[PDB]
Amino acid sequence: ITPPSPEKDTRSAMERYWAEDYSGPLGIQTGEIVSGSTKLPRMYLGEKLLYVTGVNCYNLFVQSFESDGDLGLTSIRKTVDVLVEEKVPIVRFSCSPYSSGQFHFYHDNESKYLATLDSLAAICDRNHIAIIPSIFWNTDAVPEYCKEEFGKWGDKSSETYKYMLDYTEAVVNTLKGHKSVVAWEFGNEFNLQADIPHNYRISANDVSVAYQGFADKVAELDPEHRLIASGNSVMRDAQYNLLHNGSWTADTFQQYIDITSIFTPGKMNGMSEHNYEEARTFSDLGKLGRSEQVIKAKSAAAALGKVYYVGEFTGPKTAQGDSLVVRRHYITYYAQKVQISLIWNYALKGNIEWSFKADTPYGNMAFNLMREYNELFSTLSE
Ligand SMILES: [Cl-]
Ligand code: NA
């Protein structure tokens, strides 16, 4: 028989994506579910609507030189074995050295470093692990390496901005052929560095310029046009007012959409937030619980043509072992049909801040919840 259409396919998104007969676009695609003129932007994988929960594995790649010291695969393979055994479907990881003092692991021999990254992606292909590289994890590091002030991220003529383009090109060219790579994320929590009155280093508009240059370069190189994401935390309550007035006045909802747009520009359609044990407050709507915060974030995303995801949220070590604190996140994300949510943080040896490892009480707490909620997500549709 002729194979059935994507909607006629009874398999799930991840199952259809990872099947041997899949020959569709790689990575997360943005489509829309339509009711008349209403187009709700939504994530697709394997041509079906995606709903999944996974983990951060911050050091999935960088452990190859930060821990193993040789750009080898010893710890990577041990880590992937755990991810497979625990049934982790999706992982976010850092795709660059945290410190400029370790940039030599790339520049000493660029082809060796990129070969280890290619190998990681190949291992994830074979083991059916979807990964999201977060390319400029610590935004301090590139300006430091270039002996430039941090604001040069927003200056297209700077060595910092050139390095961003050159490194983006290197990563995308290495990874674009791998079906495990499902999205490209700029870096980690860049928005939190902007417009701080008593720590004044960069403006939201400068960050936006870097995001726009990143997204344009990725779009130029990636024939699969998979999701380009920010890696932002939540916007600060006052994110817009810090930029425009240098004040800590909580933003209105309209101002939140505005500043979200600055921090998710152009071709960057992945609206990341990180959900800590902190509430969202609007000057007009007030202080909200997490359910209403997610509903408001998804409403902002939809209006902007973006898709929301929770790139980090509270894990067992941050919760001091209170499973109810963690469970509250999963309850909300399932109820509000959040399409990707990633708990902080799995580390092979548990040696990353606020992280868990396998076969411990905190590890089991996280992985049991992850499996429990992927079982519920696995039938979700809209
Ligand atoms: Cl490490
Ligand atoms: Na642990």
- Angstrom distance (rounded) from CA 114 to CA 96: 11
Ligand nearest to the CA of 65: 1
Ligand 2 centre distance from Cα of residue 317 (Å): 7
Which residues, 6 or more positions from 350, have their beta carbon under 8 angstroms from its beta carbon? 356, 357, 360, 363
CA neighbours closer than 13 Å in the CB half-sphere of residue 94: 23
| One CATH from 3.30.750.200, 3.20.20.80, 3.30.500.10, 1.10.630.10 for 6-378 | 3.20.20.80
Whether omega before 205 lies within 30 degrees of 0, making that bond cis, reads: no
Nearest ligand, CA 63: 1
Ligand approaching nearest to the C-alpha of 345:
2
Q: Could you give the CA distance from residue 73 to residue 77 in angstroms, rounded to a whole number? A: 6
Domain map (residue ranges) of the chain: 6-378
What span, in angstroms and rounded, lies between the C-alpha atoms of 312 and 295? 17
Ligand 2 center to residue 184 CA distance, Å?
Answer: 28
In this structure, the number of other CB atoms found within 10 A of the CB of residue 251 comes to 27
> How far is the C-alpha of 154 from the C-alpha of 63, rounded, in Å?
30
Coil, helix or strand at residue 7:
coil
Beta carbons within 8 Å of 53's beta carbon, 6+ residues apart: 90, 330, 333, 340, 341, 342, 343, 370, 373, 374, 377
Structure method: X-ray
Closest to 252 measured CA to CA, from 263, 272, 265, 237: 237
Ligand 2 center from residue 121 Cα (angstroms): 26
Beta bridge partners of 356: 346
Span from the CA of 288 to the centroid of ligand 1 (angstroms): 37
Given resolution (angstroms): 1.6
Residue with tokens 């905190």: 362
Under a CB-based contact definition with an 8 Å cutoff, are residues 29 and 49 in contact?
no
Torsion of CA 226, 232, 237, 240, to 10 degrees: -80
User: Any idea which ligand is nearest the CA of 318?
Assistant: 2
Taking alpha carbons only, the member of 359, 332, 304 closest to residue 30 is 304
Helix (H, G, I), strand (E, B) or coil at 108: coil
Cα of 135 vs centre of ligand 1, distance in Å, is 16
- At CA 56, angle to CA 53 and CA 61, rounded to 5? 130
Question: How are strands ordered across the β-sheet holding 48-49?
Answer: 29-35, 38-45, 48-49
